[PDB]
């Protein structure tokens, strides 16, 4: 189909390592973005079939979405905050490189990104 398998959400052979920063990323950053009225297009992989988007995965080579990030945090996939932040940034980048500037999805990503950056600025030590 037009859709790939979703990204992996478990990190093979990685020891469990909980940190205040990772707790914050899940319970503050992800949770705040997840509840936002504009989160819904980003809560699961882009479904190019159900959305009739034959060009999406032609253009987006590194898919990412907040459902994947959420599961990665829940599964302790990330070794540190920067790895999780990188996935959020990839999700926003994909939106901005595929969709035409000004489209509703872009304004929604912009709103979520502003909230993201505000929360990341208060990452615990």
């Amino acid at each position: 189909s037009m859709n790939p398998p979703p990204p992996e959400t478990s990190n093979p052979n990685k020891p469990k390592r909980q940190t205040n920063q990772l707790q914050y990323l899940l319970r503050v950053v992800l949770k705040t973005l997840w509840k936002h009225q504009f989160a819904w297009p980003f809560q699961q992989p882009v479904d190019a079939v159900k959305l009739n988007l034959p060009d999406y995965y032609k253009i987006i080579k590194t898919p990412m979405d907040m459902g994947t990030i959420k599961k990665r945090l829940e599964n302790n996939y990330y070794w540190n905050a920067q790895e999780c932040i990188q996935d959020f940034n990839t999700m926003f980048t994909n939106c901005y490189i595929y969709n035409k500037p000004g489209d509703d999805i872009v304004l929604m990503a912009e709103a979520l990104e502003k909230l993201f950056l505000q929360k990341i600025n208060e990452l615990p030590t």
């Binding site: 988007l53 060009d55 969709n99 035409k100 489209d103 509703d104 304004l107 929604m108």
Partner: peptide, 10 residues
């Protein structure tokens, strides 16, 4: 691109 259309954000 094809685009995703309106998302009813007013």
């Amino acid at each position: 691109v094809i685009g995703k259309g309106g998302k009813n954000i007013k």
